[PDB]
């Protein structure tokens, strides 16, 4: 009955959308925090805000967004749209709603109102990243020119946007590091992962997954953005050295969304079929399976 | 034109550390 799963902003937690509601977990160690069997229509998307009491929920038909106060156990805000809502991103002062062709920014008050609209290319995957840091309101998304990422500063919206020619074809994945300073992107060819500085838009690192094609599902940095982990559509997760001088291949591999765990040599993986894996690795790339659990039960 | 609907009077107040670590 699982419809969606995503990590929160520091990957300390993940949240799942169910046909019968939603669930919130602590990532490492795997501990279920809350469950809400109450929504009959289910939720297709769930966004957290670190470990705060609010979640953003995408309704049954994905037409309405619901702001859920879990300390009050109630929807306190509802925003209805005339298009499918593909994704929602939160920071302390902003609610960002991703439609398949545009992104719409609202205040985060008891009665939100619209602030900005941003045209995107066709964005059925709802790709978007939003830094939540107090000193960095970076918002990034697929530009109208296919394969380019547009970077906007929500604290300084009068500027012109930075435009990164990340790929020549359709983007498939975009991730942001914890410091808001690096973005990693991949296209549907999935052959190169490319990491860019967010204030200048210039290439920092390019990694090779393989000459062959495999569809990226998720990318994530570790705490200091010295490693990244990547999951592929044939039950495959690679990790990479992110600040190595030259262009490099995968440090390590193992056999879905993925993030680094509590310990700096730990990696977590959560699968659409209900599986949860924790793996441990070595400076040289040995990958040990540590935990397997069916986290839905 | 999206339709915003408010369903609770008081302000929004971010309570960090709600989903505490085990």
Author numbering:
A (entry chain A): 9 to 263, 270 to 311
B (entry chain B): 1378 to 1399
Sentences from the paper on this structure:
PROPPIN (β-propellers that bind polyphosphoinositides) proteins are phosphoinositide effectors that play prominent roles in autophagosome biogenesis. PROPPINs adopt a seven-bladed β-propeller fold, in which the two neighboring sites in blades 5–6 contribute to the binding of phosphoinositides. PROPPINs can also function as scaffolds to integrate the phosphoinositide signaling with other regulators for controlling autophagy. In this study, we determine the structure of WIPI3 in complex with the WIR-peptide from ATG2A.
Fortunately, a loop-deletion mutant of WIPI3 (referred to as WIPI3-Δloop), with deletions of two flexible loops (Blade 2 B–C loop (75–80) and Blade 6 C–D loop (264–281)), shows enhanced protein sample quality and has been crystallized for structural determination. We then adopted the fusion strategy by which the WIR-peptide is fused to either the N-terminus or C-terminus of WIPI3-Δloop to stabilize the complex or facilitate crystallization. After extensive trials, the crystals of WIPI3-Δloop with N-terminal fusion of the WIR-peptide were obtained for structural determination. The complex structure was determined by the molecular replacement method and refined to 2.2 Å. The WIR-peptide of ATG2A was resolved (from 1378 to 1399) based on its electron density map. In the complex structure, WIPI3-Δloop adopts a seven-bladed β-propeller fold and each blade contains four anti-parallel β-strands (from A to D). The β-propeller resembles a disk-like structure with a narrower top and a wider bottom from the side view and the WIR-peptide forms a linear structure and tightly entwines around the β-propeller from the rim to bottom. The interaction interface between the WIR-peptide and WIPI3 can be divided into three sites (namely N-site, M-site, and C-site, from the N-terminus to C-terminus of the WIR-peptide). In N-site, the N-terminal part of the WIR-peptide forms a short β-strand to augment the β-strand D of blade 2 with specific hydrogen bonds between their backbones; P1379 and V1381 from the WIR-peptide make hydrophobic contacts with F98 and I96 from blade 2 and F123 and P129 from blade 3; the sidechain of Q1383 forms an additional hydrogen bond with the sidechain of H127. In M-site, I1389 and V1391 from the middle segment of the WIR-peptide insert into the hydrophobic pocket formed by I94, V93, I84, Y65, and L60 from blade 2 and L107 and F125 from blade 3; the backbones of V1390 and R1392 from the WIR-peptide form hydrogen bonds with the sidechains of Y65 and N64 from blade 2, respectively; D1393 from the WIR-peptide forms an electrostatic interaction with R109 from blade 3.
